[PDB]
Ligand binder design. Structure first.
Ligand code: ADN
Ligand code: CL
Ligand code: MG
Length: 346
């Protein structure tokens, strides 16, 4: 077991994948192609779906990312994860699935609440998602979480964790800050996380070494924080401005990097070396035949997972981005977030 190289916090979700007739979508008032949170009546969808013998997969942004890390590091217990689940059957199913993959996990159990679950409904070549977050929102790091984190030097949190409470991400980042060789990495996760948690992020970013995000996320960050994307010069301007939220214009000599994925366009990143100078990185994204692209859901999670894996191996920024691109490219060729040990990238 171990050593654990990467530790992450997130909202754990059990994904249930199955092909269903259109009548199923209509019965639960679902619009094909949309992704939503379950309404009261839609709550009955989960036990109903269990009867379809769905493929059960661990899910949730951060959990998907560490599963990629765990996959690439190979050795059992190479990546750790903490989050909240319920004391229901789904909670045990999720834990067992994670155990099967060799991921080290410590789930806080919230008695009487349901484990996060997402119905991944396949119909007419489209995926319709209906998620019930449940226990995820009650997560609070245990007082001895650092013991679980062992000698990990790479910490990751998604902005989605701010929903339960910004205190979890703040505590993880604070712990990482006290360790010279450790880094804290954050995902912007969604434009609304950027909007809702403006104040919290202001403080958190000053304790962040690597910031991940896509175009829309960075665009809102630039507006919210008045920092200033299909256009390069503009993307660079945004990244350069965002880097200031991490450095405050000072040079601690610690890792300071902002990485912006831009769909098909090249990844753009702005870095401040221990030297104190700013550097702009640009890495093109290898395309795959349109005929292979099956499910784009999880591409971003895979990118971060691959980047973190490469980072744990001491690769250059560009190599980390290249590994992330390769992982994203690999996962979109099948529905649901999963990877096989054969022909792994990076
Ligand atoms: N707020 C969230 N926190 C954690 N996992 C999430 C969240 N929203 C969606 N997910 C999961 O992550 C997948 C997308 O990366 C979704 O299909 C779902 O299973
Ligand atoms: Cl998450
Ligand atoms: Mg540190």
């Amino acid at each position: 077991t171990g050593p654990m190289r990467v530790f992450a916090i997130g909202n754990p979700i059990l994904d249930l994948v199955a092909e269903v007739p259109s009548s199923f979508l209509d019965e639960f008032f679902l619009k094909r192609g949309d992704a939503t949170l379950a309404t009261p009546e839609q709550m009955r969808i989960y036990s109903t779906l269990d009867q379809f013998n769905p493929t059960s997969l661990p899910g949730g942004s951060a959990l998907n990312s560490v599963r990629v890390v765990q996959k690439l590091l190979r050795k059992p217990g190479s990546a750790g994860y903490m989050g909240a689940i319920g004391d229901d059957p789904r909670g045990q199913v999720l834990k067992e699935l994670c155990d099967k993959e060799g991921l080290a996990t410590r789930f806080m159990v919230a008695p009487g609440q349901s484990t996060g679950v997402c119905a991944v409904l396949i119909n007419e070549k489209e995926r319709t998602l209906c998620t019930h977050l449940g226990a995820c929102g009650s997560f609070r790091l245990p007082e001895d979480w650092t013991t679980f984190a062992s000698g990990a030097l790479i910490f990751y949190a998604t902005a989605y964790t701010l929903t339960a409470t910004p205190k979890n991400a703040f505590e993880v980042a604070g712990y990482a800050h006290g360790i010279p060789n450790a880094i804290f990495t954050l995902n912007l996760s969604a434009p609304f996380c950027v909007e809702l948690y403006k104040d919290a992020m202001q403080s958190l970013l000053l304790h962040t070494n690597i910031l991940f995000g896509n175009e829309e996320e960075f665009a809102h960050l630039a507006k919210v924080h008045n920092l200033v994307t299909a256009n390069k010069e503009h993307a660079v301007e945004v990244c350069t401005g965002a880097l200031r939220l991490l450095t405050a214009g000072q040079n601690t000599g610690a890792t300071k990097l902002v990485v912006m994925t831009r769909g098909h366009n090249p990844v753009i990143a702005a870095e401040q070396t221990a030297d104190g100078t700013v550097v702009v990185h640009e890495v093109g994204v290898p395309v795959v035949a349109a005929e292979k692209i099956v499910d784009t859901n999880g591409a971003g999670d895979a990118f971060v997972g691959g980047f973190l894996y490469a980072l744990s191996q001491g690769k250059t920024v560009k190599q980390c981005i290249m590994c992330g691109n390769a992982c994203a490219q690999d996962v979109i060729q099948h529905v649901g977030f999963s990877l096989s040990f054969t022909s792994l990238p990076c």
